[PDB]
Amino acid sequence: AANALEEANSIIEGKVSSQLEKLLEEIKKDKKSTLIVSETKLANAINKLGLNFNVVSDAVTLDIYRAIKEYLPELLPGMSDNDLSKMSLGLAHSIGRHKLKF
């Protein structure tokens, strides 16, 4: 949860976390691949890294992200809908405490 809050805060701030650095670097072997990102701020941040990715953040992509979020529990084997909801509940309180300067 401590890591999740740190990763959650980086996403909100539009900054790239080290956990996301490593994950992208794994796919770096693929030359000239386009990266679809939900948020423009994150898209710009990923571009600055010098990764060989054409980063795109367009209104049309919102349909892709929209379908994925609908069928996310089925997309991710091994995690049920209840677990994702119960993970969201715990992470939300942790973020709310940080935002409220608790």
Binding site: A1, A2, M87, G90, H93, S94, F102
Partner: protein, 177 residues
């Protein structure tokens, strides 16, 4: 960590596990076995507490607060141990003081009957009818049900006399009674 209070309703068990799980952040496989040793894994709480601890809405409290949760829990833990010791002391003392009465009804019930009378001397002086209503408020002796309760009250009155007016009471008459 509010979730644990639901997992382990048994309060005495809850305190012991709280002493081990001081901080929900600390979760190791070896620790899982150690808390698995606490009580049994048949309920499965050993796996649940690890899963809940990783992800929960509990707000971390200060180190000073945690010091009092454990220290206050030690006070509760000690009292339970002493209560068990005092209970065993009661049973032994009931046998020597009131062997006939303790044998007939029991050490705890007989001791409560003595307290309601105010003393063993008071109990032995009462008539059988008064002894029955002496334990008619906590249901100590409890239409056919009423007959036994009255019958047991008369025998309890007799047993209290053998205990009170004997220098070294035996349990021989309480057994046949």
């Amino acid at each position: 960590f509010p979730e644990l209070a639901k997992l382990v309703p048994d309060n005495y068990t809850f305190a012991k596990l709280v002493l081990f799980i001081k901080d929900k952040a600390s979760l190791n496989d070896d620790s899982l076995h150690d808390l698995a040793a606490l009580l049994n894994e048949d309920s499965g709480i050993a796996q649940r507490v690890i899963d809940n601890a990783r992800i929960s809405m509990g707000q971390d409290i200060s180190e000073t607060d945690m010091e009092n949760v454990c220290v206050f829990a030690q006070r509760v833990a000690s009292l339970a141990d002493y209560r068990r010791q005092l209970y065993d002391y009661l049973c032994e003392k009931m046998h020597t003081v009131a062997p006939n009465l303790s044998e007939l009804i029991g050490e705890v019930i007989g001791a409560r009957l003595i307290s309601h009378a105010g003393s063993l001397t008071n109990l032995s002086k009462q008539a059988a009818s008064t002894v029955q209503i002496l334990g008619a408020e906590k249901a100590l002796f409890r239409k056919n049900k009423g007959r036994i309760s009255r019958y047991l009250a008369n025998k309890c009155s007799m047993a209290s006399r053998i205990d009170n007016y004997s220098e070294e009471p035996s349990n021989v008459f309480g057994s046949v009674l």
